[PDB]
Amino acid sequence: NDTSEVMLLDTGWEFSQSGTEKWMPATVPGTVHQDLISHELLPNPFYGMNEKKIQWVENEDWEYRTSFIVSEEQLNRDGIQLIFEGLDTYADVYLNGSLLLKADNMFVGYTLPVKSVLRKGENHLYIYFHSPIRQTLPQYASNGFNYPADNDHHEKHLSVFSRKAPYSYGWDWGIRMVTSGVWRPVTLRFYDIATISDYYVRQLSLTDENARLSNELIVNQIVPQKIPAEVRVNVSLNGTTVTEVKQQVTLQPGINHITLPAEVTNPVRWMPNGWGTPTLYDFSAQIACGDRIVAEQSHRIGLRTIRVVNEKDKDGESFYFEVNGIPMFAKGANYIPQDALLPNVTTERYQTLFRDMKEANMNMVRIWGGGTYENNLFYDLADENGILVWQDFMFACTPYPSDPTFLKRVEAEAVYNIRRLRNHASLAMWCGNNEILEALKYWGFEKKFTPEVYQGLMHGYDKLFRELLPSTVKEFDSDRFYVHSSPYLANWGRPESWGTGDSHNWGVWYGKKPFESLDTDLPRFMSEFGFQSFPEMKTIAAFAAPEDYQIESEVMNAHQKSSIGNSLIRTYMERDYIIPESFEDFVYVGLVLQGQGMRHGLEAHRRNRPYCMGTLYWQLNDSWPVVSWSSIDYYGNWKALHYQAKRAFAPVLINPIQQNDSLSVYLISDRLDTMEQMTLEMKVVDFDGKTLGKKIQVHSLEVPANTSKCVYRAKLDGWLTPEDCRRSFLKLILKDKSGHQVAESVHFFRKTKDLQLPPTSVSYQMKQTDGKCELTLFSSMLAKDIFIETPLQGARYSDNFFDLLPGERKKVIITSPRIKKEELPVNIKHIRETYK
Ligand SMILES: OC[C@H]1CN[C@@H](O)[C@@H](O)[C@@H]1O
Ligand SMILES: [Br-]
Ligand SMILES: [Br-]
Ligand SMILES: [Br-]
Ligand SMILES: [Br-]
Ligand SMILES: [Br-]
Ligand SMILES: [Br-]
Ligand SMILES: [Br-]
Ligand SMILES: [Cl-]
Ligand SMILES: [Cl-]
């Protein structure tokens, strides 16, 4: 890289509750709450009813200190810069008697010149964190109304006054832990001549023949003299130079703007997951002053075009992604913070979450606007997994202030994070907020405030989301799409709006609509829809003692943040399943339910391309142990929904859909190549494994690239009696001309509660090696929605939550670093076992 030296300020930190003068070791990056936990000064916040027990923290102020040594040689470098990648939130930063900074925005990184303030020998850094509650109580007192941020779990809704992660105040799947601290790294850089403050690789054009780039650098030179320099940009792939360009300059004191064009002939394109390789070039910019490289900065760069097509059409207004010139059906989910305490999220946890997205056939993730702008690692992993990123700005579900001071704060954060993120191949679009305009129009605020205050909120909306944010995107990321809000117009109660742009269809769940409604209530793009489940028993055991395994234990209830939820789960369960008498069986069936219902929607959305061009379910993941809409619980365990999403998002899918006592079969493909001379084969099998009638064959089928087409239709009457529909299933298989199987599905003709499932034992043989367990499962009769349950937290399965078919063996590999060459406890559940 270059001649600079970096000192990480990540050890030797102490913290103190202000006014106590009592100090203890801290971990940085970190949080006040974690530091307290680490010294048993707080109980496990996620356990039982500990939520109320930890709230006192947000009322105190907190101080952090560290000491470090600087040598005479270090102090003689031309420049010395202290960088805070993140301070949560109101932080007075002192070094050696100087107030360097009064921080006030969790989402902004600060770079501070400190050479003239540093001393040879010991140097003392000291940070005072004002309570974000006590900082904002006087601001609320001045305001004369309470903003309607119902997810802020306090009588006074103070969240809206602070540029701090909205979810930290609470959410409808989240614990309240209003934390503070040095939440991202602190670095001291000792350098000569200059630093590169920003490097932007701006793609000017891209064809199969040529990529044209403009390398835009901002160089901050710290010395008083004029300094001859050569700027060099090297473009490489897998360690081999593809192109190199240079420019002679003379760097002036202060900011210098340097622009070097570069071209890449016959570029290797970045493709999204499912369509090819997510190829990334390495672009390195260096400043050379004579022999020495005084500054260097690199980015991984993907060469691709992303256009968001949002245009008036015959159906209303389209909303879809075109990637490298091809309409790409979006398949993915909404991402929330992985933890209540952000610095606790490790590299390994980020890697695993991406492995979970990639393995479920996803190509998109929405970074929802009540969390954070994610760390750099998150976007790097999106780049290398070919996952497009929809980035909200951090505003959600409430109007916000719009006074000049506040807007200037927000402007700083928008500029910072835009420049931080704009080089990522995965970055697809920006969205001003989550649900704010929908809130303003439909959530009844006009009965909560004076007409004057309401008008003020409406004008304040425009100032921020229709003016400041789009203008900032236009200036700093001019070829990326921005939309002011998600959903921008469509509302779930208003079918007339559903052909316009993206939908959050909360008809299912909030409107109590059955999952079958998802076949009829179609959006142009589904940016949210969802259904809750209790996480599995090992996760419940992590927050509850066995006496508090009920639905409505006090316990229990502390881990259900919606209000609404437990009763809705039982209501929906009764529609399709027998409600089990035991809590453990209810948990298992609720997982099955969430997975089955949701996959029915995912299937409808893809089936109804091109009217519908994407589906992002609510929600991928959890921030703590809780009952929620997630497909993956806090401990990384896949719920049934994650396996079902994987199946529903398979590049080629056979989709049987039965409505009005009739069956249709669609073939759905997101491949880039067309498949020709295909055969769909079907057969009706009873629960004892006996074929009813004969095989049905449909030959000569084509499955064009990026299409959903019906290839088969039949009435049930005259084919199967009501009795057969209760006692049999349909096997569907698709094969190429040579008879190689490319897809398979199973279809049931009745609701699970209406099936005549036989009593059955699932037997298994277990071959255990290191970190691995191979089970071979057998049942002579159908075992419905089987759940292979192990007590090992985070264990991975090759499959789970599937129907084990009569007399058809099935191999499942379980993996975990904790499986020893044995021995693994296995409990196999299936539907019939849940009642008598
Ligand atoms: O209520 C579930 C979710 C609905 N919409 C999302 O944008 C989130 O605010 C909620 O947690
Ligand atoms: Br300096
Ligand atoms: Br600086
Ligand atoms: Br300049
Ligand atoms: Br009011
Ligand atoms: Br706009
Ligand atoms: Br169906
Ligand atoms: Br039907
Ligand atoms: Cl505890
Ligand atoms: Cl980070």
Q: Is 20 left (phi over 0), alpha (psi -120 to 50) or beta?
A: alpha
Question: In the 3-class helix/strand/coil scheme, how is 4-42 assigned residue by residue?
Answer: CEEEECCCCCEEEECCCCCCEECCCCCCHHHHHHHCCCC
Residue nearest to atom 10 of ligand 1 (CA): 172
Longest CA–CA span in the chain (Å) reads 93
Q: Which DSSP helix (H) or strand (E) runs through 140?
A: helix 132-143
Distance 258 CA to ligand 4 centre (A): 7
Report which ligand 1 atom has the smallest distance to the Cα of 618: 3
Separation between Cα atoms, residue 474 and residue 468, nearest integer Å: 10
Distance 637 CA to ligand 9 centre (A): 23
Residue 242 neighbours by CB under 8 Å, 6+ apart: 235, 236, 264, 281
10 Å CB burial of residue 629 (0-12, 13-18, 19+) is: buried
Residue nearest to atom 7 of ligand 1 (CA): 434
- Burial readout 119-135 (b: 16 or more C-beta within 10 A, e: otherwise): eeeebebebbbbbbbeb
Separation between Cα atoms, residue 541 and residue 558, nearest integer Å: 14
10 Å CB burial of residue 673 (0-12, 13-18, 19+) is: exposed
Separation between Cα atoms, residue 328 and residue 160, nearest integer Å: 36
Query: What SS3 class is residue 189?
Result: strand
Structure tokens that stand for 229 in this block: 């320099």
Please spell the DSSP secondary structure of 495-513, one letter per residue. Answer: GGGTTBSEEE--TTTTT--
Cβ of 528 less than 6 Å from ligand 1: yes
Separation between Cα atoms, residue 427 and residue 200, nearest integer Å: 14
Please provide the distance, in angstroms rounded to a whole number, between the alpha carbons at the two ends of the chain.
69
Distance 283 CA to ligand 2 centre (A): 27
Q: From the CA of 746, which ligand is nearest?
A: 7
Query: What SS3 class is residue 629?
Result: coil
- Bridge-based pairing state of the strands 79-84 and 98-103: unpaired
Separation between Cα atoms, residue 282 and residue 303, nearest integer Å: 11
Chain length of the chain: 836
Q: Residue 464's closest CA among 518, 382, 399, 523?
A: 399
Please spell the DSSP secondary structure of 393-453, one letter per residue. Answer: -S-BSS-----HHHHHHHHHHHHHHHHHHTT-TTEEEEES-BSHHHHHHHS-GGGTS-HHH
- The Cα-based distances of 724 to 390, 554, 561, 660, 695 in angstroms read 46, 45, 43, 17, 16
Q: How was this one solved?
A: X-ray
On whether the CB atoms of residues 28 and 181 are closer than 8 A, the answer is yes
Separation between Cα atoms, residue 522 and residue 708, nearest integer Å: 15
Q: From the CA of 117, which ligand is nearest?
A: 2
Cβ of 618 less than 6 Å from ligand 1: yes
Cβ of 335 less than 6 Å from ligand 1: no
Separation between Cα atoms, residue 243 and residue 268, nearest integer Å: 14
Report which ligand 1 atom has the smallest distance to the Cα of 369: 7
Cβ of 172 less than 6 Å from ligand 1: yes
Distance 86 CA to ligand 10 centre (A): 8
10 Å CB burial of residue 753 (0-12, 13-18, 19+) is: middle
On whether the CB atoms of residues 388 and 321 are closer than 8 A, the answer is yes
On whether the CB atoms of residues 117 and 95 are closer than 8 A, the answer is yes
Q: From the CA of 310, which ligand is nearest?
A: 6
Q: For residue 46, give the DSSP letter.
A: T
Distance 329 CA to ligand 7 centre (A): 21
Please give all residues whose CB falls under 5 A of ion ligand 6, grouped by chain where several chains appear: 466, 470, 484
Residues followed by a gap in the chain, C→N > 2.5 Å = 821
Distance 450 CA to ligand 5 centre (A): 4
Pocket test for ligand 1, best of 334, 526, 528, 620 (most atoms within 8 A of CB): 528
- The Cα-based distances of 378 to 187, 359, 416 in angstroms read 20, 17, 17
Separation between Cα atoms, residue 106 and residue 432, nearest integer Å: 18
Please spell the DSSP secondary structure of 553-586, one letter per residue. Answer: -HHHHTTB--TTHHHHHHHHHHHHS---SSHHHH
Separation between Cα atoms, residue 460 and residue 455, nearest integer Å: 8
On whether the CB atoms of residues 249 and 260 are closer than 8 A, the answer is no
Domains and CATH numbers, the chain: 1-192 (2.60.120.260), 193-302 (2.60.40.10), 303-649 (3.20.20.80), 650-751 (2.60.40.10), 752-836 (2.60.40.10)
Report which ligand 1 atom has the smallest distance to the Cα of 562: 1
Q: Residue 683's closest CA among 693, 675, 673?
A: 693
The residue type of 205 is S
Distance 648 CA to ligand 7 centre (A): 13
Cβ of 434 less than 6 Å from ligand 1: yes
10 Å CB burial of residue 612 (0-12, 13-18, 19+) is: buried
- At 15, give phi and psi (nearest 5°): -135, 160
- At 683, give phi and psi (nearest 5°): -150, 145
Cβ of 192 less than 6 Å from ligand 1: no
Distance 82 CA to ligand 3 centre (A): 8
Q: Residue 647's closest CA among 795, 802, 827, 786?
A: 802
- Bridge-based pairing state of the strands 662-669 and 707-715: antiparallel
- Bridge-based pairing state of the strands 194-206 and 210-221: antiparallel
Angle of CA points 17, 21, 24, to nearest 5°: 65
- The Cα-based distances of 700 to 6, 52, 210, 423, 680 in angstroms read 65, 65, 40, 46, 9
Cβ of 397 less than 6 Å from ligand 1: yes
Separation between Cα atoms, residue 504 and residue 331, nearest integer Å: 15
Which residues are registered as beta bridge partners of 664?
Answer: 657, 713
Distance 725 CA to ligand 8 centre (A): 10
Q: How many CB atoms lie within 10 A of CB 529?
A: 26
Report which ligand 1 atom has the smallest distance to the Cα of 486: 7
The owner of tokens 């205050």 is 453
Pocket test for ligand 1, best of 394, 594, 618, 624 (most atoms within 8 A of CB): 618
Q: Is 12 left (phi over 0), alpha (psi -120 to 50) or beta?
A: left
Q: How many CB atoms lie within 10 A of CB 800?
A: 23
Structure tokens that stand for 648 in this block: 């529903």
Query: What SS3 class is residue 215?
Result: strand
Distance 657 CA to ligand 7 centre (A): 4
Separation between Cα atoms, residue 749 and residue 727, nearest integer Å: 9
The owner of tokens 């202060």 is 254
Angle of CA points 556, 557, 559, to nearest 5°: 75
